[PDB]
Amino acid sequence: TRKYLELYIVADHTLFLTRHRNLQHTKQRLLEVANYVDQLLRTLDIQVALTGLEVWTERDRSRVTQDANATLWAFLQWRRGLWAQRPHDSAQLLTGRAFQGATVGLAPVEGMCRAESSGGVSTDHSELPIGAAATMAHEIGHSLGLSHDPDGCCVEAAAESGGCVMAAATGHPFPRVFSACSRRQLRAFFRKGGGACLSNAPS
Ligand SMILES: *[C@@H]1O[C@H](CO)[C@@H](O[C@@H]2O[C@H](CO)[C@@H](O[C@@H]3O[C@H](CO[C@H]4O[C@H](CO)[C@@H](O)[C@H](O)[C@@H]4O)[C@@H](O)[C@H](O[C@H]4O[C@H](CO)[C@@H](O)[C@H](O)[C@@H]4O)[C@@H]3O)[C@H](O)[C@H]2NC(C)=O)[C@H](O)[C@H]1NC(C)=O
Ligand SMILES: CNC(=O)[C@@H](NC(=O)[C@H](CC(C)C)[C@H](O)C(=O)NO)C(C)(C)C
Ligand SMILES: [Ca+2]
Ligand SMILES: [Cl-]
Ligand SMILES: [Cl-]
Ligand SMILES: [Zn+2]
Numbered sequence: 001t002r003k004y005l006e007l008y009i010v011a012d013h014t015l016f017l018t019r020h021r022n023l024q025h026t027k028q029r030l031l032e033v034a035n036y037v038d039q040l041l042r043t044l045d046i047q048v049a050l051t052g053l054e055v056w057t058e059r060d061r062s063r064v065t066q067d068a069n070a071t072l073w074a075f076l077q078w079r080r081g082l083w084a085q086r087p088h089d090s091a092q093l094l095t096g097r098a099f100q101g102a103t104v105g106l107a108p109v110e111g112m113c114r115a116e117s118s119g120g121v122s123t124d125h126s127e128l129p130i131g132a133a134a135t136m137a138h139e140i141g142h143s144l145g146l147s148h149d150p151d152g153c154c155v156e157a158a159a160e161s162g163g164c165v166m167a168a169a170t171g172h173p174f175p176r177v178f179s180a181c182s183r184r185q186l187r188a189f190f191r192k193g194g195g196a197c198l199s200n201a202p203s
Contacts, residue, residue: 003190003198005041005140008052008088009034010075013060014096015124026055029129033094036133040165041140043177044186049202051088068099072106072121079119089197090143091119092136098123104170107139110189113197118143126172134174137165145189146182153181 009030011019019026030053038048062078064071071093079091090112104123111117120139124132146166154164162173166182178186189195 001199002201003046003195004201005046005048005198006051006087006089006200006202007034007037007048008054008082008086008091009050010053010091010093011055012064012093012095012097013056013058014064015094016055016057016096018096018124021057023055023057027053029124030055030094032129033124033133033136036130037092037137037140040133040137040176040178044144044183046198051202052086054082062093064093064095064097066097066100068101068103068106068121071095071097071099072108072119075121076108076117076119080115083115089113089118090140092139093119093121094124094132094136095121096124098125105135105139107142109142110145110194112140112143112145112195126174128172128174130174130176131170131172134162134165134170134176137178138170141166141178141182144186145194146178146185149179149181154179 011026034050062074075093107120108117122135148168149166157177162175164179165175
C-alpha cells in the first residue's frame, strides 16, 4: 500500500511575463518547484507524479486577482473542465501575482480528490524554487486534512533547518519536512477514508 499524488501544475500569465515570456524557462521553473514538492511530500511517504504541466502564455484561463480566495475558487472552477480532459489528483496554480494581506497560498481543507476543491494556489514569492514549493506543499497539506502545526509540534527541524511545512507563516530558510504531528494527522485522514485517489500508482 503506497501513496502517489498525481499533480498537475499551472503557471499563470503573470508568471510567464516575469519570466520574460520565455516558455522553456517558465516550464523549467514549474519542474523545479514540482521536484521540491515531491521531496517535501516524501517525508509523508507520498510520492509525487507530475501528470501535466501548463503555461498560460496568452491569457489567464481563470481570473487571477489580488484576492487570494477569489483566485483560488476561480481556479478550482476552471480545474473541473481541465480534469475531464487531463485527469489528476490535485491541480496547483503558481502565480506571479501578489495577494493582499501578505497571503502567499490557499487551499480548501480536506478537499483532496473532491471534484469541486482538489487544488490550491501559490504565489512564486521567492527567488528560490523551494519557497514556492514549500507553500504549494503546505496547501496540498490542507487538502490532505492537515492543520497548521501546534506550537508543541515539529520537535526538530531547527530554525536554521527551515522548520516544518505546516507552519502558519513562511520565509527563508524554507521547510523541507512535515512534522510528526502532520504525519499522525495524515494517517488518521487516510484511515477515515480521505484521499482515496492517492492509491493508484501512475501509469
Ligand atoms: C472564497 O470565495 C468563494 C467563492 O466566491 C466563496 O464561496 C461562496 O460562498 C457563498 C457563501 O458561503 C456561497 O453563496 C451561496 O450561493 C448559493 C448559489 O450559488 C450559486 O451562485 C454563486 C454566485 O453566483 C456561485 O458562486 C455558485 O457557483 C452557484 O452557481 C446560494 O443558493 C446560497 O444562498 C442560500 O444559502 C445561504 C447559505 O446556506 C442562505 O443564507 C440563503 O438563505 C440561501 O438559501 C448562497 O448565497 C457561494 O455559493 C460560494 N461560491 C462557491 C461555492 O463557489 C467562499 O465563501 C470564500 N471564502 C471565504 C471568503 O472565506
Ligand atoms: C509570507 N507570508 C506568510 O507567511 C503568510 N502566511 C501564508 O500566506 C500562509 C501560507 C504559508 C505557506 C505558510 C497562509 O495563510 C495559509 O495558511 N494558507 O494555507 C502570513 C503569515 C503573512 C499570513
Ligand atoms: Ca491518483
Ligand atoms: Cl491508523
Ligand atoms: Cl477507523
Ligand atoms: Zn495554511
